[PDB]
Amino acid sequence: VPQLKRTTMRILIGLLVQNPELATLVPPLENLDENKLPGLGLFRELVNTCLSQPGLTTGQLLEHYRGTNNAATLEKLSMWDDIADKNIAEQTFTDSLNHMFDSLLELRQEELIARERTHGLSNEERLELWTLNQELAKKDDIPF
């Protein structure tokens, strides 16, 4: 078992590999841009494998990826932060899903600030940035 720093995507991917039934808790991710958030593309792939192979075990899930360039990462995460308590696994998974979407909100806020600095914002973007600012105020070679 490796010692890895926690990140949101490490928690989500580790818990999903260890408990493939958590895939059915994940809302549709098809339209999200994997390029903005390291680990999101792999997480979405794993969800899709689970939903495509109901009944699968952790070992069966990992088998699909063992010849890919993510095999080492997934093997490490399959053994890391193991939570044998399904109550805690589900609650931690749901909490981290919410944190992932919070991070996408912060990434969008940063995108709007970049546009603002380079050529200004439209009325619609100004409303979005205002709501994001209020909402966010209220709130080892693995590459994510």
Side-chain angles (χ1 to χ4, degrees), residues 1-2 4 6-30 32-144:
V1 171
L4 310 167
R6 288 170 86 87
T7 73
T8 292
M9 295 315 300
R10 285 171 193 206
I11 296 162
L12 287 171
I13 284 164
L15 283 172
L16 176 63
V17 164
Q18 291 156 12
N19 311 267
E21 74 276 17
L22 297 176
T24 309
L25 302 171
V26 181
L29 309 175
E30 301 71 48
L32 303 180
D33 187 352
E34 55 275 23
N35 293 311
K36 320 223 188 72
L37 190 47
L40 173 57
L42 177 57
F43 179 60
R44 177 171 61 202
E45 283 193 77
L46 291 159
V47 171
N48 286 334
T49 303
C50 292
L51 299 175
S52 300
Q53 302 276 275
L56 81 172
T57 65
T58 294
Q60 284 176 312
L61 173 58
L62 289 169
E63 187 68 34
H64 292 278
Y65 293 79
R66 91 178 284 285
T68 77
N69 282 330
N70 285 308
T73 285
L74 293 170
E75 285 164 26
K76 292 165 188 178
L77 291 172
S78 77
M79 307 185 282
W80 170 81
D81 166 83
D82 192 275
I83 302 178
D85 184 341
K86 296 285 180 173
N87 301 118
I88 303 180
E90 291 207 1
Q91 191 53 68
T92 300
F93 192 78
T94 297
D95 289 346
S96 293
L97 278 176
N98 283 322
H99 293 140
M100 182 187 76
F101 287 110
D102 289 347
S103 290
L104 289 169
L105 291 182
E106 188 180 9
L107 289 162
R108 174 66 176 166
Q109 184 219 52
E110 297 164 358
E111 174 170 46
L112 291 171
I113 288 165
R115 295 178 182 179
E116 179 170 58
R117 294 174 173 184
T118 61
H119 69 277
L121 296 181
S122 66
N123 281 20
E124 291 73 26
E125 292 170 326
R126 289 176 32 242
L127 173 59
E128 186 182 0
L129 181 51
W130 188 99
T131 63
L132 287 166
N133 284 343
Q134 295 293 317
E135 176 82 1
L136 274 334
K138 159 185 121 288
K139 299 197 154 102
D140 194 343
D141 70 342
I142 292 176
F144 53 80

